[PDB]
Amino acid sequence: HLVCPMSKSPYVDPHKSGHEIWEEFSMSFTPAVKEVVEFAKRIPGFRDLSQHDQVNLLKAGTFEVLMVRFASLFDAKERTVTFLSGKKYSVDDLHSMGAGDLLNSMFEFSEKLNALQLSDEEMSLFTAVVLVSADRSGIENVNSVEALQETLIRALRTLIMKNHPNEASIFTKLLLKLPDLRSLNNMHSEELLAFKVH
Ligand code: COH
Structure with a gap:
């Protein structure tokens, strides 16, 4: 099987x-x-x-961007994953075909993110933050990347403070999803590389 919803x-x-x-x-x-x-x-x-x-x-970041953008493919209530065809599959069926801990972690992430109920403009700006927070291992001008990240992050704080004047903790919660995305990226890359067809 190929248990990736892409x-x-x-x-x-x-x-x-x-x-x-x-x-x-x-x-x-x-x-x-x-x-x-x-x-x-x-x-x-x-x-x-x-x-x-x-x-x-x-x-380094495309995966993490896509994980945010497609979090909604994971329906924690229904316990289903929607593949890019529109077809839905249960977690049990997917576990049977070889999905495991990483799928579960993805449901966890998606449930918590889907829960925050971000507007499109909020999600969009968060996603930008995610992209420019990507692993810096290949990067040649680190200070320029950190400056862009700082810029976007301030913009994100300002937007969350406008949209949620009594719930600033949403800002902090979003930043705390960055190490979670990096963990998902790490594990997923192992699965990707270990993939055999026969
Ligand atoms: C929204 C989440 C997401 C994204 C963006 C994504 C994006 C990509 C991507 C981007 C171009 C590529 C080349 C792949 C490639 C793969 N993914 Co994903 N995968 C994703 C979620 C998953 C999940 C979930 C699994 C199964 C994990 C598990 O528990 O075994 C997965 C499994 C795989 C596998 C292994 C299949 C198997 O062993 O049956 C490959 C290969 N992939 N994936």
């Missing part, structure tokens, strides 16, 4: 070669990836980073 379905044709499986999978996830590139380009300070650093932040 796929159209978790069922894999055992006659198809691995190259063929991956290529099919790629027609499903590539449009989502390109959408993160387009989004990055609309963060004004992102264009002022070095070309190398833009590419590196996208490299």
Whole structure:
């Protein structure tokens, strides 16, 4: 199976070669990836980073951006995951096909985030913060990346304070999701690389 909801379905044709499986999978996830590139380009300070650093932040952060953007695919009440085809699958069925601890963690994250009930403008600005908070391992101009992050974070504080004047803790709660996203990224990358088709 292929229990990633970026796929159209978790069922894999055992006659198809691995190259063929991956290529099919790629027609499903590539449009989502390109959408993160387009989004990055609309963060004004992102264009002022070095070309190398833009590419590196996208490299390290795309997953974390997509995890925020697709948190709603995880329905903690119904205990279902919606794949990009529109089809829904139960957690039990997905556990049976090889999902495990990482799926559970994703439900946990998604439930807490989905819960905060962010507006679109709030979610959008948070997502920008997530992107520019990506792992700095490849980065050549660290101070420029931290400056953009600080800029976006102040903007986020100002927006949450306008929209939630008596609940400033929402701001802090969002920042606390950054290490959680990094943990999800870490574990997911292990699953990605350990993926075999036969
Ligand atoms: C919204 C969450 C999300 C995103 C954005 C995402 C984005 C991407 C992505 C982006 C281009 C790629 C190449 C992959 C690639 C993979 N993902 Co995901 N995955 C995600 C959630 C998951 C989950 C959940 C699983 C199964 C985890 C588990 O518990 O086994 C997963 C599993 C996988 C697997 C292993 C499947 C298996 O062993 O059956 C691969 C490969 N992937 N994933």
